Short mmCIF file of C-alpha atoms (C1' of nucleotides) and ligand atoms in Angstrom, two decimals:
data_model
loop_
_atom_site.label_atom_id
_atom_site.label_comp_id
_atom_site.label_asym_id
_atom_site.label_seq_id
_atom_site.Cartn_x
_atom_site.Cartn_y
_atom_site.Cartn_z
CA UNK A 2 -9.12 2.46 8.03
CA UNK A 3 -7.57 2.26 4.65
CA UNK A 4 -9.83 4.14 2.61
CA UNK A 5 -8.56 6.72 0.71
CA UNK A 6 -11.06 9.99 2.18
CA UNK A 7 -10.92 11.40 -0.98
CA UNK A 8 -11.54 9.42 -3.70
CA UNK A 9 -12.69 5.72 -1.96
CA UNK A 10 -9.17 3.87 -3.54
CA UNK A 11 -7.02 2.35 -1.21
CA UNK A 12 -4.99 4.87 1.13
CA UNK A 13 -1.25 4.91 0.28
CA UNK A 14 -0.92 7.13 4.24
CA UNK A 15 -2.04 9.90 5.85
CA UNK A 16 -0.59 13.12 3.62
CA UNK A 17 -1.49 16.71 4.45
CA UNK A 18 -3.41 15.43 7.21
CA UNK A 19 -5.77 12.77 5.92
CA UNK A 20 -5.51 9.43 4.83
CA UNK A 21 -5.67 9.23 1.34
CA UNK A 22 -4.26 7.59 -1.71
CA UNK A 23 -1.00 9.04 -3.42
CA UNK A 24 -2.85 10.29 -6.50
CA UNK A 25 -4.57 12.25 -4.17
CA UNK A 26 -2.12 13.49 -2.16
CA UNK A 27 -0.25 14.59 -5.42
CA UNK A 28 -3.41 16.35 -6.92
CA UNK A 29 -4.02 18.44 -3.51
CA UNK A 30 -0.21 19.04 -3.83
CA UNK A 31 -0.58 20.81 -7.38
CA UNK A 32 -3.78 22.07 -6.54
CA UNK A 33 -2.93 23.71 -3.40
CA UNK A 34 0.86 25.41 -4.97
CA UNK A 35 -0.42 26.26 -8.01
CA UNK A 36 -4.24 28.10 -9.33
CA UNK A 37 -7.13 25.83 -8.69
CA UNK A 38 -10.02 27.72 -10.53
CA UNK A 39 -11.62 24.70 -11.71
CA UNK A 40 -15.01 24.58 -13.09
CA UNK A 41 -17.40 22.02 -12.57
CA UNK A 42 -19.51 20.90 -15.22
CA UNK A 43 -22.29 19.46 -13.07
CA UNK A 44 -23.97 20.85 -10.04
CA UNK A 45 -20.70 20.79 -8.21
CA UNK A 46 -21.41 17.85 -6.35
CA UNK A 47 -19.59 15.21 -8.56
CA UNK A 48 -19.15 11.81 -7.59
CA UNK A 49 -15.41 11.16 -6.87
CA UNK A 50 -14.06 7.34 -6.92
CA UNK A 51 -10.98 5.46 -8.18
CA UNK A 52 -12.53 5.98 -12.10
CA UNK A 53 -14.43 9.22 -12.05
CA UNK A 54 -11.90 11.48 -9.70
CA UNK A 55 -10.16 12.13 -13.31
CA UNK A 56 -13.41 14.09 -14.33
CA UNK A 57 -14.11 17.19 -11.73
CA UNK A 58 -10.51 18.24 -10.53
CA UNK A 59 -12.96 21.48 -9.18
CA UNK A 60 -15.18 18.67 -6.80
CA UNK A 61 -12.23 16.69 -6.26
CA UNK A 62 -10.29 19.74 -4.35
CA UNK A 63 -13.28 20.59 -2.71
CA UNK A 64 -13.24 16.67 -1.60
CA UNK A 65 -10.18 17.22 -0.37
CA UNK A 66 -10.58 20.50 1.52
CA UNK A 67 -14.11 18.49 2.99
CA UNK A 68 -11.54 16.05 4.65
CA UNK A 69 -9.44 18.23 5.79
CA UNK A 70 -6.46 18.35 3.97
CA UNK A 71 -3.75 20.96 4.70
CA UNK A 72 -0.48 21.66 3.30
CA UNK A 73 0.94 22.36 6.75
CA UNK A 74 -0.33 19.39 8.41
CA UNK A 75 2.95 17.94 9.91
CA UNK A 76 4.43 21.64 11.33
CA UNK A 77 0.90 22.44 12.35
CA UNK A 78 0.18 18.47 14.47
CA UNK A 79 3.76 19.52 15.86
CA UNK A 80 2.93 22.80 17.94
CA UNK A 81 -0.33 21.47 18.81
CA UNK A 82 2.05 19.20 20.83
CA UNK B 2 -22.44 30.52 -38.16
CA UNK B 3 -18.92 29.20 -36.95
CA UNK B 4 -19.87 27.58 -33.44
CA UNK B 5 -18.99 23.84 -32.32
CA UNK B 6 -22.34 21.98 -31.90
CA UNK B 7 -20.57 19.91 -29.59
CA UNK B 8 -19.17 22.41 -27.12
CA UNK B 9 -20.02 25.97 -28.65
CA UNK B 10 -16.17 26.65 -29.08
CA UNK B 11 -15.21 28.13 -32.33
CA UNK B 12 -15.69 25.20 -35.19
CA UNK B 13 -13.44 24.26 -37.96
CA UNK B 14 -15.95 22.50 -40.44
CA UNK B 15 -17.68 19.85 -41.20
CA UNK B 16 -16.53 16.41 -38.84
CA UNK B 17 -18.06 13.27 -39.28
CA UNK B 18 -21.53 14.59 -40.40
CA UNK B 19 -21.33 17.68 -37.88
CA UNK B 20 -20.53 21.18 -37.85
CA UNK B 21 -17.56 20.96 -34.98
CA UNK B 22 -14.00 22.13 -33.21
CA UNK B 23 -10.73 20.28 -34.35
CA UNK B 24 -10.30 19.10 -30.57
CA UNK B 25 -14.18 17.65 -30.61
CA UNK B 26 -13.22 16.08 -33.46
CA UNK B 27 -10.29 14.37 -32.77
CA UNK B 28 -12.00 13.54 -29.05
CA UNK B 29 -14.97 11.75 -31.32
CA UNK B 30 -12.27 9.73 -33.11
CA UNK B 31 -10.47 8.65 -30.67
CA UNK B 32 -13.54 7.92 -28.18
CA UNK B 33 -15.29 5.57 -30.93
CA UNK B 34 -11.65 3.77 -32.32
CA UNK B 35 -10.56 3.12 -28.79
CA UNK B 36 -14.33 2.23 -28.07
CA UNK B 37 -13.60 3.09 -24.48
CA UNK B 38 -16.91 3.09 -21.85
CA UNK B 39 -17.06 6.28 -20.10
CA UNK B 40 -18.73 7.31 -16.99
CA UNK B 41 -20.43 10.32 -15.40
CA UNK B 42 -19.85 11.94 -12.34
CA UNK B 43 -22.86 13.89 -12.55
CA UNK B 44 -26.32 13.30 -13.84
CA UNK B 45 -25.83 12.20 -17.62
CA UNK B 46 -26.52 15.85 -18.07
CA UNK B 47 -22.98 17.99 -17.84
CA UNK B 48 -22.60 21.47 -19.23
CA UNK B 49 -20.20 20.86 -22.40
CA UNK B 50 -18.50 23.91 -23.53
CA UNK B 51 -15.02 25.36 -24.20
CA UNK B 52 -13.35 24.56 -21.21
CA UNK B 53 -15.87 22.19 -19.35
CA UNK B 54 -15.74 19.61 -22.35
CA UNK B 55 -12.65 18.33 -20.82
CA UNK B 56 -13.92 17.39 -17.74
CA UNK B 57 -16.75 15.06 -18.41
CA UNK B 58 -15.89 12.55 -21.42
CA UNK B 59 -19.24 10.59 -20.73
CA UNK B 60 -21.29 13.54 -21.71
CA UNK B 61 -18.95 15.24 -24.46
CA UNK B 62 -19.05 11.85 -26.04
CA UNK B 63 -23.17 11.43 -25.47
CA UNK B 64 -23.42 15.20 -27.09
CA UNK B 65 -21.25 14.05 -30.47
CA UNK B 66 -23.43 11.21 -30.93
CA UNK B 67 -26.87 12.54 -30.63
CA UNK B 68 -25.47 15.73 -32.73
CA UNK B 69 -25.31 12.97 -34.97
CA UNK B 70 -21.30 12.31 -35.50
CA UNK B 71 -20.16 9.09 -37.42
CA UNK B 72 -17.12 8.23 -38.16
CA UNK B 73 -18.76 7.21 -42.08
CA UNK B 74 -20.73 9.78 -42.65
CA UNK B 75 -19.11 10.82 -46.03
CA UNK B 76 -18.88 6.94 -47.12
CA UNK B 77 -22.66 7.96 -46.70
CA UNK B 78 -22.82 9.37 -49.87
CA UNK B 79 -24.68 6.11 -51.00
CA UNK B 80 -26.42 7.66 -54.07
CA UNK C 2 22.20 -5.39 -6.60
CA UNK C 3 20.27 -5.20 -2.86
CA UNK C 4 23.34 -5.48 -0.28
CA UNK C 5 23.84 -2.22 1.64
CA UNK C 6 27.29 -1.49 0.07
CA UNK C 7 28.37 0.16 3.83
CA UNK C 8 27.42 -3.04 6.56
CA UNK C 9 26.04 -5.55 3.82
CA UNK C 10 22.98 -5.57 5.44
CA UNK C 11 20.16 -5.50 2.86
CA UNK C 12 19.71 -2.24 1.30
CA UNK C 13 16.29 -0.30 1.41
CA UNK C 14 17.26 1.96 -1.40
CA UNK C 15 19.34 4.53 -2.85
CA UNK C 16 20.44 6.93 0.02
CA UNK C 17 23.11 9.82 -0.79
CA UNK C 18 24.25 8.84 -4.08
CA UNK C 19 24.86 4.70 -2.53
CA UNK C 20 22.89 1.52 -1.98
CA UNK C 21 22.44 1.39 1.48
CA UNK C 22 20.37 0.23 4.36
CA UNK C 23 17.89 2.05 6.70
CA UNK C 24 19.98 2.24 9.57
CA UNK C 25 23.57 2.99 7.17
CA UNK C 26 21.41 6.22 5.92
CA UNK C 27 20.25 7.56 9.00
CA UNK C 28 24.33 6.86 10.66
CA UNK C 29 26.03 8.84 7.57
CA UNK C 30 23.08 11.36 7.82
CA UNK C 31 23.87 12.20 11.42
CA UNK C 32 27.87 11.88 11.17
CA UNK C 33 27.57 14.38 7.85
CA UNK C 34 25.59 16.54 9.98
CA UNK C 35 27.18 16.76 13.36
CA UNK C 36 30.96 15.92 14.87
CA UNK C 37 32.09 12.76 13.39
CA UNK C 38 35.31 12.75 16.09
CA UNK C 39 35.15 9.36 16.24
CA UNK C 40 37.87 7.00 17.77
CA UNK C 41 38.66 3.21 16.44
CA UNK C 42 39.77 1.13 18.98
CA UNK C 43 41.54 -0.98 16.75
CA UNK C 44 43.62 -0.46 13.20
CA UNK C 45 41.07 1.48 11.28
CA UNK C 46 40.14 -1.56 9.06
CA UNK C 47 37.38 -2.49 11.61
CA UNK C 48 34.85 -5.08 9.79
CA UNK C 49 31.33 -3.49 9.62
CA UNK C 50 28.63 -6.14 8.97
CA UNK C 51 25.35 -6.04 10.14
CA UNK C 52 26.08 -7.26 13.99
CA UNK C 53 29.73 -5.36 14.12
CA UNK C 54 28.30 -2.08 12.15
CA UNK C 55 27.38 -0.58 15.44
CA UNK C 56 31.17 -1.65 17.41
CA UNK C 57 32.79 1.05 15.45
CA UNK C 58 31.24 3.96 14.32
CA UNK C 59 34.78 5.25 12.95
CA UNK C 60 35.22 2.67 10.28
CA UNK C 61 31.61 3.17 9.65
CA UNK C 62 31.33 6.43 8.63
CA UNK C 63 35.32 5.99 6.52
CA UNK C 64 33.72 3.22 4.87
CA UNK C 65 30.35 5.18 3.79
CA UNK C 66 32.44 8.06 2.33
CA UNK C 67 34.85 5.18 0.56
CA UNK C 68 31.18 3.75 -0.85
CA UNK C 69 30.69 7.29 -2.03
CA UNK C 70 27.73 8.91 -0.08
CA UNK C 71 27.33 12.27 0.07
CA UNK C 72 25.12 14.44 1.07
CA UNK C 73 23.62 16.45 -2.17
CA UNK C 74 23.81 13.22 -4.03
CA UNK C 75 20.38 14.44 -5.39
CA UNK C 76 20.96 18.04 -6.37
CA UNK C 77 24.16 16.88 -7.63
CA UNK C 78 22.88 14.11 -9.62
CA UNK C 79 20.44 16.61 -10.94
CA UNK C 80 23.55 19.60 -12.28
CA UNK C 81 24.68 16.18 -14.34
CA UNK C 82 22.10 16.07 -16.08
CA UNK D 2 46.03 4.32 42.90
CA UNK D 3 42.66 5.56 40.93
CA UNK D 4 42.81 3.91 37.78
CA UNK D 5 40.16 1.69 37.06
CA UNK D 6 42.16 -1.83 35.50
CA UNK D 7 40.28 -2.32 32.36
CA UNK D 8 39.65 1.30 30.84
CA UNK D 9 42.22 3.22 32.79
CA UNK D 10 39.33 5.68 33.48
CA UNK D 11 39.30 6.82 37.28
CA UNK D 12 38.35 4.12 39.18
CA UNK D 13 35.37 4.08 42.07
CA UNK D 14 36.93 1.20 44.06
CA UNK D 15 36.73 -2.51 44.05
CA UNK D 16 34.14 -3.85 41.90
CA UNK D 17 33.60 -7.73 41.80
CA UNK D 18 37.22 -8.50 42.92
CA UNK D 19 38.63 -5.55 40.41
CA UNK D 20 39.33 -1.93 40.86
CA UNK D 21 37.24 -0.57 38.05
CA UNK D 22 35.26 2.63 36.92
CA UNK D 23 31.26 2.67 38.01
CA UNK D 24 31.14 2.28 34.22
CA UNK D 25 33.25 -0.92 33.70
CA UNK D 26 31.00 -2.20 37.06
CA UNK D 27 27.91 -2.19 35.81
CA UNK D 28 28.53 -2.67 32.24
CA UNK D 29 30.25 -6.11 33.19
CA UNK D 30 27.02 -7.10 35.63
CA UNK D 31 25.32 -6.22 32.78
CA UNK D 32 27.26 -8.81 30.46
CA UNK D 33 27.35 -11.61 32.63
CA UNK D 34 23.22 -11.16 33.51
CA UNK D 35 22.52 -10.46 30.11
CA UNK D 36 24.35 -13.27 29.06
CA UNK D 37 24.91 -11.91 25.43
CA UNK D 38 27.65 -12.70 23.01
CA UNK D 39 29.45 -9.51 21.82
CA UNK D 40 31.78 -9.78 18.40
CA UNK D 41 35.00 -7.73 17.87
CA UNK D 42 35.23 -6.38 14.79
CA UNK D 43 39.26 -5.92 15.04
CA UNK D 44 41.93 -8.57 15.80
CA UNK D 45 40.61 -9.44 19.44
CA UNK D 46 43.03 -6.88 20.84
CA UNK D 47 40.96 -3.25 21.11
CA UNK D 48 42.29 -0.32 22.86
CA UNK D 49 39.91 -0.29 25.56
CA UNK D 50 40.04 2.92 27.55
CA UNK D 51 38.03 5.95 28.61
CA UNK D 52 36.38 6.73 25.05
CA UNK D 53 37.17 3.61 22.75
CA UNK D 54 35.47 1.28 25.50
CA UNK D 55 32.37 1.96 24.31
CA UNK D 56 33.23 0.39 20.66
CA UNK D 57 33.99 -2.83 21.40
CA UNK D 58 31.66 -4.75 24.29
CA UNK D 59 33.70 -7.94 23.18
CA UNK D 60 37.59 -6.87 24.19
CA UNK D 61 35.83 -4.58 27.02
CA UNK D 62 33.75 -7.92 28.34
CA UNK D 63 36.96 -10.02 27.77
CA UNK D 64 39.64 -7.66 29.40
CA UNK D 65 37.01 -7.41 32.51
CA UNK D 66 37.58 -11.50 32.89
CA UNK D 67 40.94 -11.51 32.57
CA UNK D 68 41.48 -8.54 35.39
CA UNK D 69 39.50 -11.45 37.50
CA UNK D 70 35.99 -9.78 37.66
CA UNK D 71 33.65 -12.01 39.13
CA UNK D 72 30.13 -11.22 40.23
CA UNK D 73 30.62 -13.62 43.21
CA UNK D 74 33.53 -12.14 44.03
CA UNK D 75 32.49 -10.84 47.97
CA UNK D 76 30.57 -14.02 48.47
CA UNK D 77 34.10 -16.03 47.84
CA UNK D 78 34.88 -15.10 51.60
CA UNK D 79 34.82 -18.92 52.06
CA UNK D 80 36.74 -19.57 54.99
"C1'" DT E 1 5.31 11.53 5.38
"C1'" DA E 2 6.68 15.11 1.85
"C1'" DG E 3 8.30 15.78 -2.39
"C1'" DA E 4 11.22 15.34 -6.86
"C1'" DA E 5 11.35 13.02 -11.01
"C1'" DC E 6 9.78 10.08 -14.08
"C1'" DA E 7 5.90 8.05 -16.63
"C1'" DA E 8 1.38 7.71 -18.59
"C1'" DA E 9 -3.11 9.27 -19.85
"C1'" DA E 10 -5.94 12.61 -21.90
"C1'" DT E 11 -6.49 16.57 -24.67
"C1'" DG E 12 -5.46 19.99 -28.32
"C1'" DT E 13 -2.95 22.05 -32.61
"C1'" DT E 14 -0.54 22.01 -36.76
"C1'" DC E 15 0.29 20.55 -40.94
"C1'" DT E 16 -0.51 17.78 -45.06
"C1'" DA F 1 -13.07 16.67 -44.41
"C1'" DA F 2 -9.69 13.50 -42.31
"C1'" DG F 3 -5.91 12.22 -40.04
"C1'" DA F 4 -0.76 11.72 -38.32
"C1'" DA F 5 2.48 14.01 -35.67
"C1'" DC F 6 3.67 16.75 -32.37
"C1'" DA F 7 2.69 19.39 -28.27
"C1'" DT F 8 0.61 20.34 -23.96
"C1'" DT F 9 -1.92 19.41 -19.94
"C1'" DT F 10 -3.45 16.56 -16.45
"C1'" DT F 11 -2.90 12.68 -13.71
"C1'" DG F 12 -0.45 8.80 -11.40
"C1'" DT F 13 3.90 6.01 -9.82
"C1'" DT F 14 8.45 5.19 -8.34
"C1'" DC F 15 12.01 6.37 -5.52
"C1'" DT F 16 17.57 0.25 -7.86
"C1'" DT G 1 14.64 9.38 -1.86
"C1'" DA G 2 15.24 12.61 2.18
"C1'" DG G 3 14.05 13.45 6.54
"C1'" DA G 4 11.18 14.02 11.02
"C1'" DA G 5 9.67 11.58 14.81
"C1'" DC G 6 9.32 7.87 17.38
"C1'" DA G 7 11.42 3.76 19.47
"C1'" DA G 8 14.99 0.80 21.18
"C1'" DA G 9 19.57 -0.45 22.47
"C1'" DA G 10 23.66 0.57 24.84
"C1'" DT G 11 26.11 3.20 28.11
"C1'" DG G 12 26.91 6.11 32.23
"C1'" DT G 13 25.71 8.57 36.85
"C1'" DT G 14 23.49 9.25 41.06
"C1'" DC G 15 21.84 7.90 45.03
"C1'" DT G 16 20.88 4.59 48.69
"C1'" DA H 1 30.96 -2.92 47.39
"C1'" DA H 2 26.49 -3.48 45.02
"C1'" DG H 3 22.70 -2.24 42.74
"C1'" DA H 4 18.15 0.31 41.18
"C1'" DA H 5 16.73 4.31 39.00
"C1'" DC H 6 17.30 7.69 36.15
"C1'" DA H 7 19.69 9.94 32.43
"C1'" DT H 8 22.14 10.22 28.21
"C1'" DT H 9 23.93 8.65 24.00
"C1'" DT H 10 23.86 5.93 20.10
"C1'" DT H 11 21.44 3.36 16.87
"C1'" DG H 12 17.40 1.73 14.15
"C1'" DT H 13 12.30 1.92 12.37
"C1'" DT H 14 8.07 3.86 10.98
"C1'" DC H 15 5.80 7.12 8.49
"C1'" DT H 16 -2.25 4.64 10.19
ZN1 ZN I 101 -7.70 9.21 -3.51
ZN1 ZN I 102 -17.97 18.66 -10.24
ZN1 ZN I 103 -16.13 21.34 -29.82
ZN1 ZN I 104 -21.39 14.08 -17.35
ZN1 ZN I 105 24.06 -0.69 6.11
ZN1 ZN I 106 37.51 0.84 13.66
ZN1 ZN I 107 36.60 1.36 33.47
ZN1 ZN I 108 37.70 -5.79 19.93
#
DNA sequence: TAGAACAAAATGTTCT
DNA sequence: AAGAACATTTTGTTCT
DNA sequence: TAGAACAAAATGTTCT
DNA sequence: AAGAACATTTTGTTCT
């Protein structure tokens, strides 16, 4: 494919495991090494595309959890060879 | 009574015809001068309040508006 | 510019502080890394262009330190500033 | 005698007409079949022995002619 | 592919 | 009340 | 930009 | 002597 999984704009690579774009990839980055307590103002089910994944960062990690991201992706694909 | 209509944070007066915080002010301002089109991610119907006004600009907008926000409303002193 | 500064090859980037190609990186990477006992079967002025760069991997690596790579380029770049 | 005559490596016997290393053997069958078109990056005259061989194919390639190598070397029994 | 560094967008505060 | 300036936070792009 | 992983090219050894 | 097969070393590319 070359959907992003996240956020529907075009996927710069798989990072962390998924194919996504590289604001994406960035934003699970920060999310994932820093605190993520997010709060969604809707009924955390927020529509994430190219213009609205500015709006919920708290739906847009859980997006990105959904899809499977993982910060250990590469060391973990590695010792399941 | 010292609470933003907008998003319940503490107000600073009076802003464009509504009791409101300096940051919904400034966001009213701004949203109206750079006339920029917002969406929703939700259901036209976000929770807008301290920390959540940040995350849905549709909505925060929507709120100032129908709280009745404008950028003239003291050249409304028409006799 | 855009010509690999070590084989004249075109470059793909900044790599260790130098313009460089894909292939120049990788070769200083490896020689900075590991043994770099390398013979030249000739005068040590071996020309290394794109087709010759792999005849002598002596003059190769003498002419990426003479182009100035080195290894912590980044971090060292970084104390500069 | 064990000295193979192009990279003074120890030689294996007589390869295509030449005593040479199994190395020098098959790297000039190699040459000939491949056809290909090696490039010294020197002056034409390379030290050619057991560890510089390997840098330059072209004085390797031409030193191997000049000892007399010649992949029809057994077949040029004639008479 | 992962990540540093730079850049931009978006928001908020101070000060007049 | 209103707004400019600065500051911070949040997000996105380049990596010549 | 740095680097892992994969791939290819180039060389060398064993075995018949 | 000659060569195929395998093995290793050296080099280069992709990263869906
Ligand atoms: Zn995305
Ligand atoms: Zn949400
Ligand atoms: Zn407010
Ligand atoms: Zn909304
Ligand atoms: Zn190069
Ligand atoms: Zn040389
Ligand atoms: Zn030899
Ligand atoms: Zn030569």
């Amino acid at each position: 494919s070359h959907m992003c999984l996240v956020c529907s704009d075009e996927a710069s690579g798989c990072h962390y495991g998924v194919l996504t774009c590289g604001s994406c990839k960035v934003f699970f980055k920060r999310a994932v090494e820093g605190q993520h307590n997010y709060l969604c103002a809707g009924r955390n089910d927020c529509i994430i595309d190219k213009i609205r994944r500015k709006n919920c960062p708290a739906c847009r990690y859980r997006k990105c959890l959904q899809a499977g991201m993982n910060l250990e992706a590469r060391k973990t694909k590695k010792k399941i060879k």
